[PDB]
């Protein structure tokens, strides 16, 4: 069994080659929050309103396939209400969903104040949803690496200050940057390599694609062609093993 076979057995595909000697140098670790430190999967964390309002909103969201709509529908079914028939349905990307039941106009869209999701009935907002991501069952062995070489650990996210801080508390590392953009991330990575730091970065979806390509060693989850490594196993722990045995 080659080095490619032994690494694959341990959940890791090595597309690169010299990546092994590169890792020895690494002094800083950066996570892109969504999809790496979480499953990247919205659920409803709270609903404010009554059951009739909840059934209307689910009925209209049942005709969409956007992951926000699927989460609302699934929450409503857990609460025991059922799906009702909708006329004149229209979906409007970037905004949300609209439709007609028992002679009332129902819209579901971003709230006028927050990132909350709001339910409008004949033009008045009568209910709302708080929607969050799902955290991977933690490895406090982050601390086992905070110990090891006392490496520097950083977290980048695009989500709002409320949401990215709470996670930064859930596990204990005191250095995160929230409210970011794909090109803001690239800027911070530059600004550190431009300080001679050797960076390993872990990423997943759309945003991180670009800063991964910018990393000394880059790692992409199992769910592009830029990553030195692929965690087909989606087991962050397995990687933490690789790091603390480098």
Ligand X SMILES: C[C@H](OP(=O)(O)OP(=O)(O)OP(=O)(O)OC[C@H]1O[C@@H](n2cnc3c(N)ncnc32)[C@H](O)[C@@H]1O)c1ccccc1[N+](=O)[O-]
153 binds ligand X per the rule CB under 6 A: no
Provide the 10 A C-beta neighbour count for residue 110: 14
* Binding residues among 19-58 for ligand X as defined by CB under 6 A: 34, 40-42
In angstroms, give the least distance from the CB of 108 to ligand X.
Answer: 5
Window of 67-75, 149-157, 182-190, 214-222 that interacts with ligand X by CB under 6 A: 67-75
Tell me which of 67, 104, 166, 181 binds ligand X, using CB under 6 A. 67
Nearest CA-CA partner of 228 in 16, 13, 34, 38: 16
163 annotated among ligand-binding-site residues: no
The helix/strand/coil state of 106 is strand
94 binds ligand X per the rule CB under 6 A: yes
In angstroms, give the least distance from the CB of 50 to ligand X.
Answer: 19
**Nearest residue to ligand X, by Cβ distance, number only:** 110
**DSSP code at position 150:** G
Strands 43-48, 124-132: pairing kind: antiparallel
How far apart, in whole angstroms, are the C-alpha atoms of residue 151 and residue 171? 16
Contacts of 125 (CB under 8 A, 6+ apart): 111, 112, 118, 119
66 binds ligand X per the rule CB under 6 A: yes
Binding site for ligand X (CB under 6 A): 34, 40-42, 61, 64, 66-69, 94-97, 108-110, 117, 131, 133
């Amino acid at each position: 069994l080659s080095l490619y076979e032994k690494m694959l057995h341990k959940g890791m595909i090595i597309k690169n080659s010299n990546v092994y000697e590169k890792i020895k140098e690494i002094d800083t670790i950066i996570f892109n929050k969504t999809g790496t430190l979480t499953y990247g999967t919205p659920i409803v964390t709270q609903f404010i309103g009554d059951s009739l309002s909840l059934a209307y909103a689910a009925s209209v969201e049942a005709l969409s396939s956007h992951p926000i709509a699927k989460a609302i529908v699934k929450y409503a079914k857990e609460q025991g209400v059922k799906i009702l028939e909708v006329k004149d349905f229209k979906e409007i990307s970037g905004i949300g969903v609209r439709g007609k039941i028992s002679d009332k106009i129902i819209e579901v869209k971003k709230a006028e104040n927050n990132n909350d999701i709001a339910v409008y009935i004949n033009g008045e907002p009568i209910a709302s949803f708080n929607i969050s991501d799902v955290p991977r069952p933690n490895l406090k062995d982050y601390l086992e690496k905070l110990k090891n070489e006392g490496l520097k650990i950083i977290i980048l996210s695009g989500d709002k200050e409320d949401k990215v801080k709470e996670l930064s508390k859930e596990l204990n590392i005191q250095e995160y940057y929230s409210n970011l953009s794909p090109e803001d991330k690239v800027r911070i990575i530059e600004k550190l390599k431009q300080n001679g730091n050797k960076v390993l970065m872990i990423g997943d979806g759309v945003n991180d694609a670009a800063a991964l390509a910018l990393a000394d060693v880059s790692v992409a989850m199992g769910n592009k062609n830029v990553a030195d490594i692929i965690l087909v196993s989606n087991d962050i722990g397995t990687l933490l093993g690789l790091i603390k045995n480098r």
